[PDB]
Amino acid sequence: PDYFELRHTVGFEETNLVGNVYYVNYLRWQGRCRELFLKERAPSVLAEVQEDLKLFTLKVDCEFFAEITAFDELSIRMRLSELRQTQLEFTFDYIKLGDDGGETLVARGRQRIACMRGPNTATVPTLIPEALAEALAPYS
Amino acid sequence: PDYFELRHTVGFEETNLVGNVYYVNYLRWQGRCRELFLKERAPSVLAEVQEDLKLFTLKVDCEFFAEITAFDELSIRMRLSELRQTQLEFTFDYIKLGDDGGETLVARGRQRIACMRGPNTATVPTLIPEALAEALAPYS
Amino acid sequence: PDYFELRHTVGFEETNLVGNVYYVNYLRWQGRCRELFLKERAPSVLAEVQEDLKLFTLKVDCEFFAEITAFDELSIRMRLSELRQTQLEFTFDYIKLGDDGGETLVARGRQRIACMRATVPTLIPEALAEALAPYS
Amino acid sequence: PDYFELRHTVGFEETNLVGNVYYVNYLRWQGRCRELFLKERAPSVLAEVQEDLKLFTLKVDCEFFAEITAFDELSIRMRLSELRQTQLEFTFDYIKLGDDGGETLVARGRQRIACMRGPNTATVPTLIPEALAEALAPYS
Numbered sequence: 001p002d003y004f005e006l007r008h009t010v011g012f013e014e015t016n017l018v019g020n021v022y023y024v025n026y027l028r029w030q031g032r033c034r035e036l037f038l039k040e041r042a043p044s045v046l047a048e049v050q051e052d053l054k055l056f057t058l059k060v061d062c063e064f065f066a067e068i069t070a071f072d073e074l075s076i077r078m079r080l081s082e083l084r085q086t087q088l089e090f091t092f093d094y095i096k097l098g099d100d101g102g103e104t105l106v107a108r109g110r111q112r113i114a115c116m117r118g119p120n121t122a123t124v125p126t127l128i129p130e131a132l133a134e135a136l137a138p139y140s
Numbered sequence: 141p142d143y144f145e146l147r148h149t150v151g152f153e154e155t156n157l158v159g160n161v162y163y164v165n166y167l168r169w170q171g172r173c174r175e176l177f178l179k180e181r182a183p184s185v186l187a188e189v190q191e192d193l194k195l196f197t198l199k200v201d202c203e204f205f206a207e208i209t210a211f212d213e214l215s216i217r218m219r220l221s222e223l224r225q226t227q228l229e230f231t232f233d234y235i236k237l238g239d240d241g242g243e244t245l246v247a248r249g250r251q252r253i254a255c256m257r258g259p260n261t262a263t264v265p266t267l268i269p270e271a272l273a274e275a276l277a278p279y280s
Numbered sequence: 281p282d283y284f285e286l287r288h289t290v291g292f293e294e295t296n297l298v299g300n301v302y303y304v305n306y307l308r309w310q311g312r313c314r315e316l317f318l319k320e321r322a323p324s325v326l327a328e329v330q331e332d333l334k335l336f337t338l339k340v341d342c343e344f345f346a347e348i349t350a351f352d353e354l355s356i357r358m359r360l361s362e363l364r365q366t367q368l369e370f371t372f373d374y375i376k377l378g379d380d381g382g383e384t385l386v387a388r389g390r391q392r393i394a395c396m397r398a399t400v401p402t403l404i405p406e407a408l409a410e411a412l413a414p415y416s
Numbered sequence: 417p418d419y420f421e422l423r424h425t426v427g428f429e430e431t432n433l434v435g436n437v438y439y440v441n442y443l444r445w446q447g448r449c450r451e452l453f454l455k456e457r458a459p460s461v462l463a464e465v466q467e468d469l470k471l472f473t474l475k476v477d478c479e480f481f482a483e484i485t486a487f488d489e490l491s492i493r494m495r496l497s498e499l500r501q502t503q504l505e506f507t508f509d510y511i512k513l514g515d516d517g518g519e520t521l522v523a524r525g526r527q528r529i530a531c532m533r534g535p536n537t538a539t540v541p542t543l544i545p546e547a548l549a550e551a552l553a554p555y556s
Contacts, residue, residue, distance in 0.1 A: 017486050019433040023197045024167050057163045061201035120159055151451055153302045157295040157350050179425055186487055210297050303473050304443050337439045341477035347536055
């Protein structure tokens with residue numbers, strides 16, 4: 001499809017007092033989708049982050065359209081929004097998989113990431129790694 | 141004076157493998173500061189949450205200007221940026237407190253909230269509770 | 281396999297400052313293993329536990345033997361250690377899968393749950409017991 | 417008094433859809449109480465662990481006797497149950513603070529920590545740091 005998919009059933013312990021989901025959990029789901037992409041599409045990046053490659057998070061946000069609860073089936077879909085020189089922006093479509101087959105959008109979020117180089121103290125900008133740029137081809 | 145403050149030292153477990161802090165943690169702290177203000181300044185609101193009053197987070201965001209490591213002293217400053225009759229927006233300044241007295245803005249977050257009442261099906265908005273609006277006066 | 285398996289790869293953000301895994305994450309993985317088991321093996325329980333039934337955790341624990349870091353492949357095996365009329369105990373084996381195919385007992389934990397349904401000490405749901413028959 | 421206290425109000429987002437508290441949340445609290453202790457009473461330990469010193473958690477557990485919900489006032493009390501030459505055991509008593517001054521033992525958890533030195537494969541038991549042994553003095 002146009003997106004990278006992360007299937008996730010809403011945990012019983014991922015809800016609040018009034019049955020709704022803690023807004024932080026949505027963002028945890030973003031990281032779980034972003035990291036899963038790097039494990040299956042660009043493992044080359046993963047090893048570089050353990051070295052001197054640092055994927056700085058510039059901005060992350062999320063808007064909530066509908067309230068979800070426990071045991072609701074979700075399809076967190078990631079799409080490449082912007083592709084720049086040393087930066088890139090993702091987009092996360094939180095969709096609820098209804099039993100009938102409906103696909104409603106319960107939330108949407110995006111994440112701005114910059115690529116840097118060198119030690120944590122003295123850093124420098126760097127191009128988006130080739131493997132990562134190629135893996136983001138059908139997901140724009 | 142201009143803000144409500146949450147004191148926080150960056151945890152040893154809140155720091156990852158390379159010395160960076162997961163952005164999710166910023167939003168966890170942002171959530172704590174939102175409840176500390178309530179439980180202190182407007183405790184009456186919390187009694188209403190268990191009843192009919194519902195607090196809907198419409199949108200959250202956070203921008204990052206610099207990286208931090210464990211044992212960094214943070215001053216999470218919460219101030220009211222936007223005030224409406226049914227909604228409000230909280231701004232969160234993440235001030236990295238220096239040992240010499242310096243103050244470096246390391247991050248900034250925003251949180252749009254909507255005051256709701258009623259059942260799970262038919263939610264209706266409500267005027268911002270008197271005590272909640274009262275406690276927001278010196279933080280405008 | 282006499283156990284229920286949950287495959288998990290240690291997240292880059294699940295590690296701490298010195299490159300080790302926060303112990304809280306270990307029990308975080310226990311919940312996901314218990315949840316996943318209930319989902320596939322006894323879906324009737326989940327439909328029962330949300331309105332009246334309550335699976336109350338009496339005791340959780342976890343002892344650690346070795347240390348693991350990011351991207352370490354883990355095979356979390358769950359099995360029924362003790363079965364009773366109102367209570368049941370799970371046991372979780374934390375096995376680090378070597379790059380060649382070797383296996384290492386990194387950690388091991390237990391969870392003690394009492395069935396309740398403001399609550400009433402109730403029988404273990406028959407559907408839950410039948411799904412546990414292999415993993416006894 | 418005879419323990420290290422961490423006051424904590426049960427969060428609205430820490431409680432699930434049935435009114436109970438996730439058992440994982442209990443352990444983050446005692447881990448927070450542990451880190452806050454090392455932060456306040458023995459900061460030297462927090463710097464040595466970044467080198468060759470290791471605070472290896474041998475075993476951790478927690479027993480639950482009651483049910484708590486949102487906005488409950490808790491008093492987490494950390495004591496020293498056992499101290500060896502290289503090992504130590506903490507005991508966490510979760511005390512629910514009532515409005516009428518009543519106190520109730522809600523839960524109890526413990527944690528065994530082994531002090532070791534050197535790289536992961538060359539790990540060897542080491543004596544408790546003098547800063548830590550001095551910090552555990554008012555628990556004798």
